[PDB]
Nucleic acid binder design. Structure first.
Lengths: 87, 55, 92, 99, 77, 96, 55
DNA sequence: TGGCCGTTTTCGTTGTTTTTTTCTGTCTCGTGCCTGGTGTCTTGGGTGTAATCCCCTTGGCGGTTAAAACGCGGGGGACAGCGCGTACGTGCGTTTAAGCGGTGCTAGAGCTGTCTACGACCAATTGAGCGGCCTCGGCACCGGGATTCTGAT
DNA sequence: ATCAGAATCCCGGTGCCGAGGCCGCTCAATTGGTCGTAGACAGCTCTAGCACCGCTTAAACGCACGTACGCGCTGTCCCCCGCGTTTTAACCGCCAAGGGGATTACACCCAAGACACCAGGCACGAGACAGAAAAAAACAACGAAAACGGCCACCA
């Protein structure tokens, strides 16, 4: 009965150097200034779809805690099977 | 088998997820079979496009 | 709280192929995920095969055809060889 | 004497080698968690999350983005450029079939 | 027999795809791609035929093969 | 004599072929190709007619989609002529 | 519903496969649902990239 | 001989790799146990097999015509080179919050017991849906005039 | 702007064949009843998710600065389009055969179900060593700069 500070503008936590590092893993050598906002949008869309499905599973089980298995099933049914989080 | 080979190439005696990812991506038929699978803590294969290296 | 996994069988196979090699807990978990994934794919494909032909029994024949559908080329040939040899040795 | 200062691109390449050699997650844990909780709140209020669920989500997000950047880089190189631009991302996602 | 997929046919297909100008080397490349695609589908199709211990490939065999590669086809059920 | 400029007839053909739906490859050579390829897996196979028509619908739809993506790749590089490297890029990104 | 609308635009009284393809591809949510479905004799949507037109 | 450019080397450095030392936790082995896997017997129905039939696939003949193949002129598009400017890479000082460690607490995950509503199953019923037959109108193809549109002038 | 020619649109006519309707029938959906069981609900435990505070420090951030890259422009040339002519084989129709797919009937063996049992596999504990971390170090690389070498200009 002591809830956290209302979440706002959290998209800004995806920092410029973090996206740069991810791009480095992808082999990108030079990065236009406009890339960052685009990346943020894409990421947000992806996340929305995943979290939507996960929460749907959570509600079907009449639980209030999203579990790792919920996420694994959501990802699996979108053709992005994830290994390592079973059991 | 492939993961053990990779483990010895890296002079490691215990197979870890990195070795599994390397093993899977370096074998064409396994890579085909697991084309849509993400190996947690796997990373990617070292790979730089030739055009990016200096002349 | 009893949770089954393939851990002990994976470990025996590992000792067959690399006597002095170990495995981390995470990697064993990844192996369990892998085994379950391939299991589900094969069983589901076999179910579809059985359904298409109006047969109520899944036999080793359905398993073999499913194996040919899912695995590419030489991997498929080798797997089929292993399965056939295993079934013939078992039958005797 | 003049301070030592590598030419543009050297350090980028060294970073590519560095980050392709290792496997640790590259986004900060807590801001990512806050992002997830904010987005989740717009479907149902007061949800809680298991820790390993968030870690799984993070693995999925970063793997997805890494793949997107590989394809983006290939699209950029195709146009005889070396700098990736928004139109490259949009082409990559159009061809994947997300839009 | 690969040459029976003529140059003007590929041109017509490209027209439907919105292509306005076509390099001379495209045609051979296209043929290769087509061959690969066909092989995969047919490989699966014949497999279904063989599983049923039949000698005639049916339309349903093809539909199932296509479905399991994620290219669902409507109209032949 | 009258002569249309390069491209006008191409555009006319684009409109023509996007308006209609008839199959664009000749039936018989397509059938011959199918039988030849089939022959390398199992001898003496026959085919129902509707199976071949289904295969033809699938092949032409697949190729049309590939050409749309190829065209987008060509235009991205500020060209208007599609080239083999465009096809290879498209196929790599699709994951084949 | 949508296919009937498309038929009426084409001044046809019978829905044919062409009208079904037009109806599906012109609706964002249906197109999403049937993104990986091929309608035999459906053709494609009329669509020419702007860069290809003269001027 | 003077100048300029290519190169080589050299020295500084610095970030990466390799070698050594402490530890530790994470992995390999032992133990006890119990329940899930194995042996046995039973039935029955699903699958294998045999005969038949017919329909529907393959092969051939012929024509004929539309489409494929080919030649050629040209134009416009691919492509290479060049200049520039600006956006982006690199480095440095600052700061902010990420992370870790501790402490609290309570919602809800998780397990158990009970029981009632509900679904499997079964017999009788019947009317909805399917196979078959018939017909007419929407559509398609033909032809001909009207209108549009494009390119050279 | 013009105009000619090619293409398209429209309007009407004829036909035709597939859509729509009708009728017999049959079996699949319906109803009523029975019985086992699964999941709905209550209730209890205790895990772990959340909240907070403090300290540290590494990452983020803003800015200065220099330059490599995107982009626009220009010239060139090549190869694809468009159009006329020749050829060929796709297509349509028509027929023949046989083979294989569908059908029905019979049989039997193989698997579900039940029971009885027991050993392998699975929590818990322990110890010990591979690897993580830290540190030193080697060291390989990058690249400024400079030192050398080589190349050219003039005319002698």
């Amino acid at each position: 009965k002591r809830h956290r500070k209302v979440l706002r503008d959290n998209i800004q936590g995806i920092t410029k150097p973090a996206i740069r590092r991810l791009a480095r893993r992808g082999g990108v050598k030079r990065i236009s200034g406009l890339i960052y906002e685009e990346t943020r949008g894409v990421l947000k869309v992806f996340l929305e779809n995943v979290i939507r499905d996960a929460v749907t599973y959570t509600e079907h089980a009449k639980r209030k805690t999203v579990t790792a298995m919920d996420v694994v099933y959501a990802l699996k049914r979108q053709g992005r099977t994830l290994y390592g989080f079973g059991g | 088998e492939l993961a053990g080979n990779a483990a010895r190439d890296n002079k490691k005696t215990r197979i870890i997820p990195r070795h599994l990812q390397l093993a899977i991506r370096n074998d064409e038929e396994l890579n085909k079979l697991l084309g849509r699978v993400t190996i947690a803590q796997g990373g990617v294969l070292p790979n730089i496009q030739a055009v990016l290296l200096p002349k | 709280s009893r949770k089954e996994s393939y851990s002990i069988y994976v470990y025996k196979v590992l000792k067959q192929v690399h006597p002095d090699t170990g495995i981390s807990s995470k990697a064993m978990g990844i192996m369990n995920s892998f085994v379950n994934d391939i299991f589900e794919r094969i069983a589901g494909e076999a179910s579809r095969l059985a359904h298409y032909n109006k047969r109520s029994t899944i036999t080793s024949r359905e398993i073999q055809t499913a194996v040919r559908l899912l695995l590419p080329g030489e991997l498929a040939k080798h797997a089929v060889s292993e399965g056939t040899k295993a079934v013939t040795k078992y039958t005797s | 004497k003049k301070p030592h200062r590598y030419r543009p691109g050297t350090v980028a390449l060294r970073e590519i080698r560095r980050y392709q050699k290792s496997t640790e997650l590259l986004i900060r844990k807590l801001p990512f968690q806050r992002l997830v909780r904010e987005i989740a709140q717009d479907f149902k209020t007061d949800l809680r999350f298991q820790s390993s669920a968030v870690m799984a989500l993070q693995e999925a997000c970063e793997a997805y983005l890494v793949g997107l950047f590989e394809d983006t880089n290939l699209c950029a190189i195709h146009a005889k450029r070396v700098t990736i631009m928004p139109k490259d991302i949009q082409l990559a996602r159009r061809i994947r079939g997300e839009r």
